[PDB]
Amino acid sequence: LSSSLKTCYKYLNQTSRSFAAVIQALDGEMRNAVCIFYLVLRALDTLEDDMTISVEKKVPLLHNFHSFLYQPDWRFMESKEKDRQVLEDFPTISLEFRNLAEKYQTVIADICRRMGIGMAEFLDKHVTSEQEWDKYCHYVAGLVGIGLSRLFSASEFEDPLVGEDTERANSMGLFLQKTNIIRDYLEDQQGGREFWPQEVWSRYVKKLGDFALPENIDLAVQCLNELITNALHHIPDVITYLSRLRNQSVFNFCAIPQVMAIATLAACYNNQQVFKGAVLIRLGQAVTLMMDATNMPAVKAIIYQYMEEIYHRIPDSNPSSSKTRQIISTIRTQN
Amino acid sequence: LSSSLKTCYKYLNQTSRSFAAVIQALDGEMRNAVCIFYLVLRALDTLEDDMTISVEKKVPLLHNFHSFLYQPDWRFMESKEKDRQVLEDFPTISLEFRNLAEKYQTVIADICRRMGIGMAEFLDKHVTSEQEWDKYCHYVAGLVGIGLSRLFSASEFEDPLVGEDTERANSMGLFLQKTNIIRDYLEDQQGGREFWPQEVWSRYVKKLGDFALPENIDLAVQCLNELITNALHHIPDVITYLSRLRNQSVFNFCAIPQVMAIATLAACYNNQQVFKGAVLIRLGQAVTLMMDATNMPAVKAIIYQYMEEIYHRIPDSNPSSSKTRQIISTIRTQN
Amino acid sequence: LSSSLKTCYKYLNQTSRSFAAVIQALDGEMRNAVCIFYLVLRALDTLEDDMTISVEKKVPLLHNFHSFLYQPDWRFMESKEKDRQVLEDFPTISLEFRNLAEKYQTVIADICRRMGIGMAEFLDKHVTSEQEWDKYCHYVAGLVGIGLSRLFSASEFEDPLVGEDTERANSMGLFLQKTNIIRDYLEDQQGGREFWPQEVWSRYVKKLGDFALPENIDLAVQCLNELITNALHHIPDVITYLSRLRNQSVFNFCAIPQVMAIATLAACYNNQQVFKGAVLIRLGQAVTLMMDATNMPAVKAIIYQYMEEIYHRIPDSNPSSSKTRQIISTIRTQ
Amino acid sequence: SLSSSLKTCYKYLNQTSRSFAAVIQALDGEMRNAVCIFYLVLRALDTLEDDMTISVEKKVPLLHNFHSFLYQPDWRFMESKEKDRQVLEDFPTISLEFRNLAEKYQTVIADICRRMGIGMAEFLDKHVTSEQEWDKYCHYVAGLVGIGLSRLFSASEFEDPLVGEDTERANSMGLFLQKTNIIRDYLEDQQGGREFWPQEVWSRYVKKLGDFALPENIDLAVQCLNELITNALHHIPDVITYLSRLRNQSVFNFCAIPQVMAIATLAACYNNQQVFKGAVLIAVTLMMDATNMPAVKAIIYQYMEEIYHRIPDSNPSSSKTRQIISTIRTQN
Amino acid sequence: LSSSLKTCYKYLNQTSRSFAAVIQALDGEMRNAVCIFYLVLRALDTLEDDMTISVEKKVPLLHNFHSFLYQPDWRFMESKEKDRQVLEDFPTISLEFRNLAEKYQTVIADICRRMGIGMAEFLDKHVTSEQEWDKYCHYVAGLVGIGLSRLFSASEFEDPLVGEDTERANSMGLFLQKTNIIRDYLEDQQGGREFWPQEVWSRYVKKLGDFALPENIDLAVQCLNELITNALHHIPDVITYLSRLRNQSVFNFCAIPQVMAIATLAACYNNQQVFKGAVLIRLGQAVTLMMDATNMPAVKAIIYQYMEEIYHRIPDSNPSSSKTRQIISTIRTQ
Amino acid sequence: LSSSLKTCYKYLNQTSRSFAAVIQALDGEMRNAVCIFYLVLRALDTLEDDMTISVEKKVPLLHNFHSFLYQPDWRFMESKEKDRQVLEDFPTISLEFRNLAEKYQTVIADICRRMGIGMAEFLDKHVTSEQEWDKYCHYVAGLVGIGLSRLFSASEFEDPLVGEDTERANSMGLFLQKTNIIRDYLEDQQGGREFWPQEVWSRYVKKLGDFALPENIDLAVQCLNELITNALHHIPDVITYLSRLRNQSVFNFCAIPQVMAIATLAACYNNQQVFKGAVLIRLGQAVTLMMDATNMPAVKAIIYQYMEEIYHRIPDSNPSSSKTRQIISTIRTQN
Ligand SMILES: CO[C@H]1CN(c2ccc(C#C[C@@]3(O)CN4CCC3CC4)c(Cc3ccccc3)n2)C[C@H]1O
Fold first, then answer.
1. 10 Å Cβ neighbour count for B152?
2. Distance from the alpha carbon of residue B255 to the mean position of ligand 1, in angstroms
3. What is the CATH number of domain C1-334?
4. How far are the Cα atoms of A10, A11, A256, D127 from residue A36, in angstroms, in the given order?
5. Which of D286, D289, D305 sits opposite F20 (nearest CB)?
6. What is the domain partition of chain B in residue ranges?
7. Which residue of D110, D157, D182, F33 is surrounded by the most CB atoms within 10 Å?
8. How far away, in angstroms, is B145 Cα from ligand 1 center?
9. Chain breaks in chain D (C to N over 2.5 A) after
10. CATH number of A1-335
11. Is the domain covering D1-332 a CATH 3.30.1330.40 domain?
12. For chain B, which chains pass the contact test of at least 3 CB pairs under 8 Å?
């Protein structure tokens, strides 16, 4: 009934392309909790992205963002990004945050603190190792999967296990983040951002930006398949995690984005287009045509169908061909 | 093995484009009760539309139609309409009506009696105020939502509350009827039928027929968007009503047509093609692709997706622009 | 993390174009049990189809196939089939089979044995009568539907009532098989074998190969509608059988294949393309574009929409029209 | 408000039914009225069969056409002198509600009424002789009813299609109840001039069935009582199988409770001289009711042991009784 | 292991002869929420019944009782009633109240607030019409059935439709209350408390206390039967309300007390003993002892047997005979 | 249709007045396993209790009994007990023991082995401390609770937790055993056996037999209430144990005997009749009557009512009054 809450949801739909719909469809207290949660992370993320903010002035913000949640008057009017109104009109957001049950804000604020730490940390460096890729993805998405699970277990809509297995929840976050990192190479590159792991791309070319160069299209695709193969290893945890949910609204919120990500990886696999523009979500085969992602067995079938689309297009001489068949074979056989 | 019951279903399939399937999919008792309810209403509508029937002769028929249900031999042989078979062979349909449990009989007859009254009432006039629009929609559709709701409750497949809350039931009907009226502007025009509320279109043109003329397309679309905005006010009730359903076959029957109507309004909003012919139902955003309208959370997600599709296309100039944002905001925040 | 199990699933995906995913989606012990069940039946079918194997050497292999399951070192390297890797490497499959629980093994073996016997029977004869056509289908598909039902109950993921209803489980199989046969006419014509009952086509033309003759397209399409009408008679049992299920993974597994088959028949009905080439699962109505085969009410709606897509195309010319409408009518009032 | 005719039917149900009104009224949705009406028409038919003031010549056509009177709106019978005659004199009210039932239910009920009428007519001139004939008679008046009820459960979709298809198990449900009642109502019937115990059985004990009423034959009476009960016990395995297939709670309650009461009646009558002098009066159990399958099994097993340890070694059925009880005990 | 919570359950058992067991049997959070709810109502009721508290002092206590839940030190030490311990040690009870989740606190406080106003309203008067009887029963019990329903839904153990149906929840309360009021005629008369509606008993006697007079036994039993007939009218709602429940612990909690009340009315119907002391629930027709009140179909059967017990004892001469038959007919038929 | 298996069931019904029915009602594989388990224990108990079998002969019989299960022809023809038939025809029982799945054999044999040793350990002594009472009861009943639980988990009709939590399984047996020992005081006394713990009764009289003396009735009842109070301490575990069962047949089997034991204790509490003969079912209350022990909530309510029947009788002057109120209070407020 609130006017500020009405504003929060307006922002959610303003800044979110993939989650407003499933968030708003969440039952009870999760609706506003997840909604608010998304808004604070957006504002936080909007800070790390504004390069017009000196590193000397930005480190503080990231580190003490979790504290601005309790500062009714706090805000930021010195941002030029496109999602500024959430910082400028942050008071409206912080307000609703404080209207949440403590237990929920005890989770959201903890994550905001821990994320701000990781984000600041990677502020003056790029991802080198695959281990550091995980690490970075942990700070910006893995902790969100962890934070979301704890919110679910806290509302009691889901068993406490969900919130306890930070590992599985971590994978949920990593799979989405890696998928988007892979798919947005060109966009990120043209923006001056580099997220692909140097220890992986340096085996192909001198510098990451070279993949934007058409003469390197063959090497680029090869690196793409290696990165995708890497992300595929999280699928086992995704299935395990999804298979433990019992609340329908929570399952949709969780399953749908994951399936959309898997669908994106299948479309991007061995696809030169990843280096020319944006990629389009191929719906599944003739079987998936008759099924959606709202029940576990169907989500399984859909995933397996997307694996065969990848498996069937694997180039014999691709340097990762063996690795790709290995993980896919593991996904087919695991139960 | 009843030839008459078989004949009824043959008729159901010959006249119901979008309901035969979901109707025949209803569990047990509701199947025949809803099939027959559709057929009798179908016959009533056929009489109501037959312009070759003099008013003086049509009024008593609409008024007394409900009584023919109990007259074994009653039938109408002077109709030229396409679906005239349900009138010429009414004895077959009325016979099955009399075979339904008494509790379903009383609901259908009562609704038929009240609908006939309202249909005759609007035979000599057109819709003036937006209030008359609601009254007209109530008589030919709202009452149907209420009738169906009463059958669902009486069958025990759904809670007593579904049949009791007539306002929510009424909204289900108004939303479908308003959507179809908005969608079929042109077709009705080329038929001497005017359903758009006078007190609304008279603010853009002086002759409803003027919207078909393109010197006014810009005004016609303004009127179009206003009416759609009116119709959107029923969605909160539609969500509330669907949220109370617990029987899957009933949920399918109720939700699917509602979701299709919402998809339709989104495909007509600020769309010039409405005044040039038929419109198509673009799928639902990337997410929707993975969601069937067979569970409440999914239906919500879908409904929100469409709301944003409309919200994203609101011209700042459109005279209803702020009302359209207002209702959409109320729908997305309201839990 | 078993090596041989991973291989079985590699063959599952390899040989099956439409069951792999739904099989891998099955709950607990049904997963490997049905996968293995599909591979063995696959190997067995591979033999029957291989025409290089003599009529005297084939019969034995068919009759004893079920025993090979317990004979570790048993293999077969003298086949020219595209899916011979299952025969050549049968030990990998027999091993995992032997790793299944006793309850599952029993079922699978029994079906293989009975199927074997049946397949041998039609090695020298042909599909003459419709009753005969049911007989064959019962052997190559009907019994499989029963085996699956039994596995569901044995797994106890489904009520004991499922495995008991052998009559409708058999119908599940008969419907799919008659459908594949009807849709795969030309490919089977240009292949050497004919599965369409002579008693039915013999009343249309003198040779099944004659349907491939453009100068008979009419007679062709008419014989087509006639057979399809025959397959539609199984739908009531399919609906009843599916209505009984309570496990989501089992329902998806049973319902999606059946629905696709129905979509198939609706595409083939009164269609010439069944004789020139192969058909497309043309889109469904507007409503169906909303639902998917994962819950019974939705499966009913989808079925009804295909029945109407067919019914509205019935030409009152067809010697079958009367019968086509008759069964659909029955399907509508159930 | 709605149908006062239906209210009259439930009034008759409670008027004529001593043991089923409550569980029938408790059935879910459609089964409720269908089973109520089914009970009432059978009750009218039985009232005609049992009325001895109606000559056999006049009675046979009524029994043969009863199933058709269901479709004759004004038909009724005003010459019955039986205590339950109100259902015949006001049959129009009952057939009216019978005709308001969905057709799939009418079909089942009329069919059972038709077949039962034929069977009842067939037994008006003859007595029950062989055990095979005893089953036949029980099939007509009760076996077909179990079959009828089962077909209604499947037709309603509250139970699996199998329930109505397995006519043998459904038939056993009826026989067990009817044999039990026949065994328990020996005296009452003898005093009414009606004989139901198989002649080929009681003849091996006395010359005239009415002799068991005589104290000087009590020992022989009890021996016969035990042979019949022993016979009746053979239906239990089928009863258990039947109940174990039910999935609807209201249907389970309706089917099991009557069967348990009948089993409790046999246990109370076994080797009991009371069956021949007056009326018979019906510990782990007392913590359980007959509303879930495992509990029903337990209750049945307890009753079986009650009979088992009471079996007189001298009794000539002694071995037959132990064998069937052992068979029930070890049955899966 | 809270000592204060330990004390609350101790108080629950000291004051509730017929609810402690089913309350302690409730799943998860409903357990404490309903225990506390019972205790605070027990205190409020003791205040209402204490005739040593003047009306001008009592009105504020009743009106503001709900606010006392949030006053840690509030308590009442001037009561002479038998259950005054909950009032004298109210802080221990209000403490556990404040420990309950906010969603439960809100429902309990709201019902105390509303009940406080209703009780106060009736301090200066006796129940007159049957409409007034319903209003009074609504205030002291109807609101509790409504409150309990909201607690069930708030805990998620029950569907939200349960708390939403205030009409039937209200009937659940009126039924228990009217039954107790009927049963306790004598005990209330000897206590100087009159609850039987005046517009009803004044048609039989000059003073409600006259029913305690042996020479009016006949006019007393008739009034008794008229009140029971009135109470029977809530059974349809009771059955409807119970059919909606899905959680076993909640079902037992709601069904058992209703069934005991039904057994009580049957025992009291046309029973002279009502005016000479308490009445014994013995009851049980054939079927009964082979089924208890823990599943809906059984509950229905048990209720039907009790309705038949009453129906079979309805005297022709009784002024309510027709009405009594009508309502039971309605119960058994629909 | 095995003649040896039905002979086994004949013996079960012949030697078990209160478990034969619920055992026979057990689902699938549990049925035979539990039937056989009961028979072998019945045979073992028949040896232990036979006083015509010398200590010299008995010790080897109790210690090796478990091995006789594997010896096809082992039998014992010198028993003078009433149930000697199971010993003389042991090959029939052992044959069926060996036909059970190996996993069940492991359990049954293990328990017979452990029980054998425990019984042997007590042939030469009486029960002294309360710690020893627990030990004796563990050997003859607690181990059975553990064994039965392991059979349930092995069969998979119950979760592995049922079999793993041996402490709760042990409590189920101790409760029943302690209840039987309390109830059978007088019968055992006239039998020459003493089971009441000496460290408890000695604090009241010189010899256990003195409680049977009319002049010691007051002291006797006091002792009785102390032992009963002791037994009540297992109730929380009984509730915990039963609350975890998922299979209806297993629930009935475990719950009914437990509730019956609770009713017995309630009936014996502060009851002088315990020392003049036997006692029985204090028929419950008004709430009880309306509920059976086939669902957990109902079992809880039934148990709580009996706790109150006891609570209501605790006389302030009983030496154990405070201890009795304490454990009962603990039983009331534990979730
Ligand atoms: C409460 O939710 C329900 C509301 N629904 C409605 C509402 C109204 C109608 C209608 C209608 C008509 O009067 C309009 N027109 C077409 C059908 C009849 C006769 C002429 C219809 C059509 C209809 C369907 C089935 C039986 C009767 C009518 N459906 C279906 C669910 O969304």
1. 26
2. 12
3. 1.10.600.10
4. 12, 10, 20, 85
5. D305
6. 1-335
7. F33
8. 7
9. 282
10. 1.10.600.10
11. no
12. A, C, D, E
